[PDB]
Amino acid sequence: IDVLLGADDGSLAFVPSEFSISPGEKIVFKNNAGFPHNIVFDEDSIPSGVDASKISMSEEDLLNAKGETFEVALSNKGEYSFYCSPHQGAGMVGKVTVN
């Protein structure tokens, strides 16, 4: 599944922000508008036992230019909440379910 970082109207959003995938499926996050952006999985809101650092950018890492990507595939089943760290309070958050 492809996910935009920033909407085409400049809104600070993942598009889509809620979605489901199958184990081993890739998510390609693509820097779109309103960047810099990143994608950070909330270590307390992903399935037990998953290493957030295997699937996340650090909060200090940024995609600063249009078209840059971060790709990650998730295997373990369950709900994963994530956010863009500089835009989290503006509402740039999401949740992917692996089912």
Whether the Cβ atoms of residue 16 and residue 88 lie closer than 8 Å to each other: no
- Residue ranges at the known binding site for Cu cation: 37, 84, 87, 92
- In the chain, the N- to C-terminal Cα span, in Å, equals 14
Of 13, 14, 27, 37, the residue at the interface with Cu ion (CB under 5 A) is 37
Quick one: which segment of 16-24, 37-45, 60-68, 73-81 binds Cu ion (CB under 5 A)?
37-45
Quick one: which segment of 19-27, 41-49, 70-78, 85-93 binds Cu ion (CB under 5 A)?
85-93
Q: Exposed (0-12), middle (13-18) or buried (19+): which is 77, by Cβ within 10 Å?
A: exposed
Which chain residues interact with Cu ion by CB under 5 A? 37, 84, 87, 92
